[PDB]
Structure formats: structure tokens, C-alpha cells
Enzyme design. Sequence first.
Site, mmCIF file in Angstrom:
data_model
loop_
_atom_site.group_PDB
_atom_site.id
_atom_site.type_symbol
_atom_site.label_atom_id
_atom_site.label_comp_id
_atom_site.label_asym_id
_atom_site.label_seq_id
_atom_site.Cartn_x
_atom_site.Cartn_y
_atom_site.Cartn_z
ATOM 1 N N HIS A 9 4.985 -6.832 -8.317
ATOM 2 C CA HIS A 9 5.883 -7.198 -7.420
ATOM 3 C C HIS A 9 5.414 -8.618 -6.568
ATOM 4 O O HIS A 9 6.389 -9.095 -5.723
ATOM 5 C CB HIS A 9 6.291 -6.050 -6.396
ATOM 6 C CG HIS A 9 6.528 -4.655 -7.173
ATOM 7 N ND1 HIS A 9 7.825 -4.676 -7.427
ATOM 8 C CD2 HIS A 9 5.933 -3.794 -7.119
ATOM 9 C CE1 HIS A 9 8.062 -3.292 -8.150
ATOM 10 N NE2 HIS A 9 6.674 -2.854 -8.022
ATOM 11 N N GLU A 34 9.730 -28.223 -14.302
ATOM 12 C CA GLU A 34 9.942 -27.189 -15.242
ATOM 13 C C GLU A 34 10.186 -25.755 -14.361
ATOM 14 O O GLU A 34 9.812 -25.658 -13.297
ATOM 15 C CB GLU A 34 8.899 -27.075 -16.173
ATOM 16 C CG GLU A 34 7.701 -27.136 -15.932
ATOM 17 C CD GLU A 34 6.527 -26.900 -16.949
ATOM 18 O OE1 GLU A 34 6.142 -25.851 -17.380
ATOM 19 O OE2 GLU A 34 6.293 -28.037 -17.380
HETATM 20 N N1 LIG Z 1 2.461 12.933 -5.549
HETATM 21 C C1 LIG Z 1 2.072 11.978 -6.339
HETATM 22 N N2 LIG Z 1 2.804 11.039 -6.482
HETATM 23 C C2 LIG Z 1 2.368 10.051 -7.270
HETATM 24 C C3 LIG Z 1 1.059 9.966 -8.123
HETATM 25 N N3 LIG Z 1 1.131 8.893 -8.997
HETATM 26 C C4 LIG Z 1 2.282 8.125 -8.693
HETATM 27 N N4 LIG Z 1 3.198 8.892 -7.958
HETATM 28 C C5 LIG Z 1 4.413 8.441 -7.639
HETATM 29 O O1 LIG Z 1 5.006 7.611 -8.633
HETATM 30 C C6 LIG Z 1 5.517 6.243 -8.155
HETATM 31 C C7 LIG Z 1 5.564 4.985 -8.892
HETATM 32 O O2 LIG Z 1 4.269 5.378 -9.991
HETATM 33 P P1 LIG Z 1 3.208 4.414 -9.825
HETATM 34 O O3 LIG Z 1 2.378 4.684 -11.114
HETATM 35 O O4 LIG Z 1 2.494 4.045 -8.824
HETATM 36 O O5 LIG Z 1 4.039 2.881 -10.185
HETATM 37 P P2 LIG Z 1 5.318 2.201 -11.007
HETATM 38 O O6 LIG Z 1 6.291 3.368 -11.400
HETATM 39 O O7 LIG Z 1 5.029 1.639 -12.181
HETATM 40 N N5 LIG Z 1 5.998 1.406 -9.859
HETATM 41 P P3 LIG Z 1 5.614 -0.077 -9.388
HETATM 42 O O8 LIG Z 1 5.720 -1.112 -10.717
HETATM 43 O O9 LIG Z 1 6.695 -0.556 -8.057
HETATM 44 O O10 LIG Z 1 4.102 0.109 -8.916
HETATM 45 C C8 LIG Z 1 4.622 6.185 -6.556
HETATM 46 O O11 LIG Z 1 5.553 5.562 -5.758
HETATM 47 C C9 LIG Z 1 4.520 7.600 -6.333
HETATM 48 O O12 LIG Z 1 5.730 8.217 -5.664
HETATM 49 C C10 LIG Z 1 0.274 11.100 -7.879
HETATM 50 O O13 LIG Z 1 -1.026 11.073 -8.151
HETATM 51 N N6 LIG Z 1 0.785 12.066 -6.864
#
Ligand SMILES: Nc1nc2c(ncn2[C@@H]2O[C@H](COP(=O)(O)OP(=O)(O)NP(=O)(O)O)[C@@H](O)[C@H]2O)c(=O)[nH]1
Lengths: 390, 302
Positions: free
Chosen positions: B258, B216
Site C-alpha cells: 500500500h 512516461e
Molecule cells: N488474530 C490474528 N489475525 C491475523 C493474524 N495474521 C493475519 N491476521 C489478519 O489478517 C489480516 C490481513 O492478513 P495479512 O497477512 O496481514 O495481509 P493481507 O491480507 O495480504 N492484507 P494487506 O496487503 O493490506 O497487508 C490482518 O489485518 C489481520 O486482521 C494472526 O496471527 N492473528
Amino acid sequence: MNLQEYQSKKLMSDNGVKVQRFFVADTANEALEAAKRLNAKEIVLKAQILAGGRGKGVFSSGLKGGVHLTKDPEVVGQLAKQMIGYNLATKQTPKEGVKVNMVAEALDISRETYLAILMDRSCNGPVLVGSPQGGVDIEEVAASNPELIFKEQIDIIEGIKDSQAQRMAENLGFLGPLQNQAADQIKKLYNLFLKIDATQVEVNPFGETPEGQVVCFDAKINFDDNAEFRQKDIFAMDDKSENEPIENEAAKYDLKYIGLDGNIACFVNGAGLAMATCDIIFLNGGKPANFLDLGGGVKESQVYQAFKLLTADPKVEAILVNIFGGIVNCAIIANGITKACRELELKVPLVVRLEGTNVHEAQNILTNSGLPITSAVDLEDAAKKAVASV
Amino acid sequence: SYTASRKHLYVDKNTKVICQGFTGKQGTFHSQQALEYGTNLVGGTTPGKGGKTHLGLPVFNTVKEAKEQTGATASVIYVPPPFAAAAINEAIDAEVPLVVCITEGIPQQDMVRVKHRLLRQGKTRLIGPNCPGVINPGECKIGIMPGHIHKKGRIGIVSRSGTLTYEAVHQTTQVGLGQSLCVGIGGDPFNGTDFTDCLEIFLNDPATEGIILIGEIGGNAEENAAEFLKQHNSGPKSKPVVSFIAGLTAPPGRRMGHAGAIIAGGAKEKITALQSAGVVVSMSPAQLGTTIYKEFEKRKML
Ligand SMILES: Nc1nc2c(ncn2[C@@H]2O[C@H](COP(=O)(O)OP(=O)(O)NP(=O)(O)O)[C@@H](O)[C@H]2O)c(=O)[nH]1
Ligand SMILES: [Mg+2]
């Protein structure tokens, strides 16, 4: 099972894993005042959905972007209103997306690494899956340059060795003193991974701040359903909107219900055998509305609720029963079908295929019942009959 | 090595079976099924019940107690999921040649731990957990599969699915080819036996002339089996192989990570992969018997 980020992160907090401090809010105004309560320079806003790729996603509101940040709290509510209740669509959601329904002290990022712990057959147990080039584009980086992905198998008896945590930390590029703090966070993640009976703990990005802090900026935890009896408090946290209420009420009597968009409601005693029935229905031209699995256990009660449930939504002008290998004589469920059909009074055709112990005395139970119940002999027969109902 | 215990997969007239969880409701029922079918069930175990008779057979506290006194060579486990993993470990400690764990619901972490030591020994072969069991049509039936559809024959059935396995069995008996040995490896990710193990047995069993593999969507199980056949079921005396993969019409799964994608890189790929190894994939689940039959006629074997 799957818990929202904010729930997975509180678990991380209580187990030595460091994350951003956050507050949850149901409404877009509470998100604004809660963002004011946080008291922090830059604040990040995230949509909570059992799915990844939120960052690069679109919105039913057209907001474009499942995660954003800003130093102005008023922009929180301004941006929170635009998604609370909308469908967030990502490359992991089924196109339509997921109905959204966290404000955390945003921290500054100076380096993103991908880290994941999981159970993998090929590795015969736990594995440390990491990459120095993390972030949203991890899968692309994983595909274009496989050598950027480091795997470290862990011995379930010996557990996480310091030499393994240090190597992974080094392969993720954590130099200098960070190498120890990261390695420790790896050991603290693995220990949590075992404590909670998780099949996956994904931290993307496994972050490095300009102030020399190793933080888990995102938490995707998959919990092993088979461990619910030992993870009461954790499985108590699964929100009361798992997929749809049509699914939850089914699970109340341990009935695995998978919904679809169709007119035939399947009813099989076996996941594999259920997917097969859906396949052969497809081959004959039908299109199943769903299927309700029975596994092995069978009780006159379940057949009662089974039929009461499949006829719930109006998109089922027919149901298909295919029980091949019930632990009880289906001559007994045949009377559970009639009883569960005449007392419920369903206005949709009903196709039954049974094969097992004393099937002769069981098939005539439906024929001499006076009810709209057509019998089938083989799987191909059951399909063409169900399709023939329009 | 653990592969040295593959041989114990081929139950037969002689294997003496016992039942862990004998007094349990499922243990009792499927134990009767085995006795009536002719399987040599010599007793079972249940803590706190040693010395009492059940179904006319002795009950013991532990497995060694049940093994030495009956000379058992196979065990079937119906212990509930919380304690099923230990039930296996008890049989391995007792060095039972074949252990068939039917129970569904064992935490993956438990089986990761069981399988860890299992690979470090070659005395005990494990089937499952969360499998229907193994049945030698006519000679021995260890598991829950309905025996009244089997018939000793020329086709070996290996299935990762559950009740779907019975369709292939019921269809090969109808066409008259019958089954040489049917094995269900179960649906859990960490198990004692996989496709490549049963294919190795089938490719080397004379009574096994045709093969049916049932799978499956999901995982790489089918592809690994495919690469095996491509390297051991090719050339001269190649045994015809048929397959059906359930779920070609299943919808997306809705991810949350992922990790799976990265360790991978189901559906058409499984189909065309099996085809690469010369396997005849039956699109409909109803024509598995009618297919293997014709592959036999294609090379005049009836
Ligand atoms: N500067 C900064 N960027 C952030 C913060 N939290 C999230 N990001 C940005 O948001 C992106 C994706 O957000 P995240 O919540 O980590 O996960 P996602 O959007 O669900 N993606 P995935 O499923 O691939 O993990 C990160 O790669 C980063 O660039 C933070 O506290 N500070
Ligand atoms: Mg992320």
C-alpha cells in the site's frame, strides 16, 4: 524485485525482527501435517503471492479470503486444498489473479498499526511511513483521514535516530513499555531495509499482542533490482515462476520482456520507446502481443534469441522492429536480423524501422535480402505497416 | 544552494569535457563520437592508466589530476554501476561544474547517498544517472544520443525517457525548428536534475522559444513539472510547450504493498495535468515535431 512473505519473514528472523514461527508446504496434505507439527493453539494460513490485499480477496475456487485462521489443524488442509493451484484475486492483482502454490503460529491481535520504510524521491531518501490505524483498510483510512499517516524522513548518513524511532512508535500509539520495544523494532527494520537494498519494507499490521509483544504480522519487501550484484543470496531466492517462463528465458540473455494479449510482437531498444510504439500501434488499430526491450547493449546473439522468443507462443502473426539509437551501426544488426531470420525461418511478417549511423546502407540490406522484411521510415509508418498484416 | 548550479546544464562551444571510464568499451566509443562531433573532449580517467594516451588524449588516474592539467569543466561517467556512484563523488570532490553520469544500474541507495551531499553544495551539477546525456546541437555533445539528428534551433527538449528522446529531436529538426538544448534527465528515481530544472533554463534561454517535455507513466515527475509551468510559464511572454507521455496503453503493474498508493493518492492524470499548465500533449509520438511547429504558427513565430 519482490519476495514472498515467508521468504521476507525468514530474512526478518535472521536480523532481529520478530515474527511468527512457520512452516512451508507445497501440497495441501503437508500443510495439514505441518500445521500439526507446529503445535500451537490457533494457527493462521496464508497464500503466498507477489501481491497484497490477500485478506479481502476472492478465489478461483470461490474460497473467498486469502488469509484465514482456526484452532483445528484438519481445517488447514480442508482450506489449503481449496487454493493451492487456484488464482487468488485482490484489488492489487490484474483481475484474473495469481496462481497460488504458509502455516504459522497465529498470535492474538489487540492493536493493528501500519508501518512502512521506503525510498521516496520527494523525501530525498528513506522515510518512515506509519499509521496507528493499520490493517487491510489502510488505504481507505489513508484516503479518508490523511492526518492519520505519519512520515519521518531519515538521514542516510546519520541513520535511524532513537528520537525518530520513539516518535514514530508514539505516533503509532505504542504507549508504556511497548514504546521502546516498538521503537527498537523500527530501528531493526530500518537497518534491515538498508542491509538488503530494499526500496520498500511494508509491515501491515505492525501488531501489538495482548501479551505485550510487538510483532510483524505481514512482510512485503520490494528489493532494488540494481543491487542484485551485491544481494546474491537474496536474488537467488526469487522463485522459478516469475510471471511466466516466456519472461525468464528472455532474461537469461538480459532481455526485458513484457507480455500482453495481442498479435503484434514489438522489439524496441528502449522502455519508453517501447511503450510509445505500443501506444501508436494502438492509435492505428493494432494490438501488440508484447514487447522485448534491448536498452542500449546489442549483440548478434540477442537478435537471434529475440526472434526465436517472440515467435514462441502462437499469438504473434507479425513482429515489429524499432531500433532508434543502437550503440552499434544498425547496418550490423540489419545483417543480424537477416541472419537471425533466414536461419530461424519465421512464418510471420516482419516490419523494421531503423534510424541511426549510416541508415542508407542498412535499409537496403533488408530490401535486397529476399526475405519477408518491410522497411519503415518513421514511427507512424512502422505502426500502420505492422497493423497491415491480417 | 544546489539550484545555483543549474546554469552548468547549458553546455556550449567552450565547455571542456573529460570521460570517466575512458578506456572502457563504452567510454572509448562514445568518446570518439564526441570528438568526431566536435565536442571538446580533453581526455579521460582510468585507475592504473594515468600517463597513457587514448584516442590521442591523455588518460589520468583521478579526476583532479585530469581537471587541473586540462582545465576540464564537464565530466561524463561510463563507470559500471557498482562503482559509478563513487565516480560521481570523485567529480564533486574535484568540483567539476557539470557531471553527466550515463551509467544505468546504480543502486538507489547509492544515489540516495550521492544526492544527499549533492544538495548540500552548489559547485557541481549532476545529470542522471541512467540518462542519455545533454547535447547543445552543434556546439557540445555530452552523452550517447546520436548527433546526426540534431540541428541548432529554437526548441528545448527535456526528456525522462531514453531512446524515445531521439524521436522528438529527429522531428523538430525535420520541421526546421531544430533544438536549442536537449537534456535527458534519465529514468532513475534519485537523480541530479529534474524537469523543473531544465524548464527553468529553457524558460530563460532566448534561443529556447518552444519546449518539448518527454515523460512516461509512473511517479509524479510530470505533475511537478506541470505545476511549475502553471506558475512560471503563464501570463505575457509564455513560451509554447508540447509534451508526449509514453505508456497510455500500458497495463496495470501488479502491486505488492500500500505504500506507493498512500504516498500518491500515471496515465490520464499526467496528461490532463500537463494540459492544466497550458501544455499541448501530442497523443501520438510521431507528431511531436508537427505539433510544436503549429503552436509556433498559432502565435506567428516562424
Ligand atoms: N488474530 C490474528 N489475525 C491475523 C493474524 N495474521 C493475519 N491476521 C489478519 O489478517 C489480516 C490481513 O492478513 P495479512 O497477512 O496481514 O495481509 P493481507 O491480507 O495480504 N492484507 P494487506 O496487503 O493490506 O497487508 C490482518 O489485518 C489481520 O486482521 C494472526 O496471527 N492473528
Ligand atoms: Mg498484511
